[PDB]
Structure 1
Amino acid sequence: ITARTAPAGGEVRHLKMYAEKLADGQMGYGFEKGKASVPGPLIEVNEGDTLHIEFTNTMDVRASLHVHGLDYEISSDGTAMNKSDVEPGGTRTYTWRTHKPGRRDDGTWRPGSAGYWHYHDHVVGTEHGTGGIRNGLYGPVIVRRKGDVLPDATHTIVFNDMTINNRKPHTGPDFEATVGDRVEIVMITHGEYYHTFHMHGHRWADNRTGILTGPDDPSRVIDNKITGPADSFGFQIIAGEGVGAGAWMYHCHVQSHSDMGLVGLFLVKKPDGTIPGY
């Protein structure tokens, strides 16, 4: 492999995070006060890393941080039941741990933490974060395994109820790339409804990484994946591989969803920066 690959993990990382009410009434996570985003900032670690997150809730209501897939003690559950939420103006240190796969004492295989995961609130609105998730308190988490292929760029697409990344319908978001770029997509679904994520002119493997192991990987190759609330998957593609440059549509394939504007553009540019037709 002549491409960049993820190293071995084991580092102890520290992070500061805030929950902010936005001017339009939404709620977002951020690494800096005044720089929150919906979806929240991407967190990327390696198998074996430990992450300490000093989380500060700047809003006037209780908020929390809850993560999927990664190892965390009950004190970092992010739920009101386990007293793991954060009071208004408060600060709490969450700890997320990751581990590598390996054989157990009984001989069974313990799975690793690697995967395309996500984090979100769990106490805003209801005891399951229905209000916080609706307001935009969600973000992606990537846990890499040693040797995983590293992309050129990563984009996060969240189907939150009837929006993409809490945006107004018919407003994208759109992304750009050049023919040959290794583009990574993190695909998260939240809210009430099922969806189907579809991409024109591109396909991926329905497995952990979206890439086939090799000639023996039996995982199916798809361009349409059904998703429900709290589903998260990801993949890597070569922009324009075997199809060339163009304005390549991605959208939900539930007919009324795409009709109502749950559509975006994957703009794959020629080496001279042009998109065929435009």
Structure 2
Amino acid sequence: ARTAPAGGEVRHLKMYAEKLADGQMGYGFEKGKASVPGPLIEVNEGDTLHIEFTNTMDVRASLHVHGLDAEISSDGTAMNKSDVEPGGTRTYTWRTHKPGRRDDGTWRPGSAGYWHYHDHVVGTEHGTGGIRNGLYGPVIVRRKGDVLPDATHTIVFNDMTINNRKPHTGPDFEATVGDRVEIVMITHGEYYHTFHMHGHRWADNRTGILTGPDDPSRVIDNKITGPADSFGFQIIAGEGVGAGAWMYHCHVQSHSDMGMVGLFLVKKPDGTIPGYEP
């Protein structure tokens, strides 16, 4: 549904950090259902979120968030003991706020935007081991009136991989011509990257959408990103270009050649993609 809503609710949520069978580490809302990337958390400006977090691993782990109003006790770092011991359980709290005028007359930003969460404790004091292994996930904070998508996809460039997948695999995403597709794009690790989508483009601002003819933001289909960068956008699938198997990839030449490639499969109403072999 378009736009909405007001926002300002208290939200409760359970979350777990698990070591997976393949040696990777992931977050999940349920035990045995962890994923890389971790599950999407979407809230509205003003919402308070209480996360009952449980470390089911044999090493210390934490939950650390970007952009959201988290107190030092919910920082998720080793230094101030806001990380979690093996088998332990801690309640992290993320608050959010609406924009508005301060007493001094200046404008307070508001927490709306495309954010992410990750471990800060596994491997090193900066979560190098955790992030490498897959302990990361997307967070979206919505402002009142923000356009809502048909579906949201998370693309994370972690080191030389997309979503910790083996080279030249996925992820591939499906859509029908006209679908409002939202992309959350996060980067992690050592390397700078350049995200690129074939046949689609977005505004380089907060939402990825231009508000009106007054917005001077650059319209792009290619964007440089570094570790811990997060941005997002919405596109109309196949808008002005029609159905097809539209590539997305890192445009760093050796990166794309070594398998940092996926497909945005845009289908006709009848379900066919020209000219693609399933």
Other structure's SS at 1:85 match: coil
**Counterpart position of 1:209:** 207
CA distance in 1, matches of 2:30, 2:4: 27
**Counterpart position of 1:140:** 138
Q: Deviations over 1:231-266 (max 9, x none)?
A: 000000000000000000000000000000100000
Residue pairs, 1:53-92, within 5 angstroms: 53-92=51-90
Other structure's SS at 1:61 match: coil
- Aligned partners of 1:28 and 1:137 also within 8 Å: yes
Q: Deviations over 1:193-247 (max 9, x none)?
A: 0000000000000000000010000100000000000000000000000000000
CA distance in 1, matches of 2:144, 2:23: 41
- Aligned partners of 1:194 and 1:227 also within 8 Å: yes
Other structure's SS at 2:210 match: coil
CA distance in 1, matches of 2:6, 2:71: 23
Other structure's SS at 1:29 match: strand
Are positions 1:223 and 2:221 aligned together? Answer: yes
CA distance in 1, matches of 2:275, 2:70: 50
CA distance in 2, matches of 1:240, 1:52: 39
CA distance in 2, matches of 1:207, 1:277: 33
Paired residue total? 276
Q: Deviations over 1:73-130 (max 9, x none)?
A: 0000000001100000000000000000000000000000000000000000000000
User: TM-score, normalising length from structure 2?
Assistant: 0.99
Report the identity percentage: 99
Q: CA deviation at 1:6?
A: 2.5
- Aligned partners of 1:199 and 1:251 also within 8 Å: yes
- Aligned partners of 1:6 and 1:46 also within 8 Å: no
**Counterpart position of 1:164:** 162
CA distance in 1, matches of 2:7, 2:217: 27
Residue segments in structure 1 that go unaligned for 5+ positions in a row: none
Q: CA deviation at 1:64?
A: 0.1
Q: CA deviation at 1:277?
A: 1.3
CA distance in 1, matches of 2:6, 2:156: 29
Other structure's SS at 1:202 match: coil
Q: CA deviation at 1:4?
A: 1.1
Other structure's SS at 1:127 match: coil
Q: CA deviation at 1:270?
A: 0.3
CA distance in 1, matches of 2:189, 2:31: 27
Q: CA deviation at 1:177?
A: 0.1
CA distance in 1, matches of 2:8, 2:245: 41
CA distance in 2, matches of 1:32, 1:122: 21
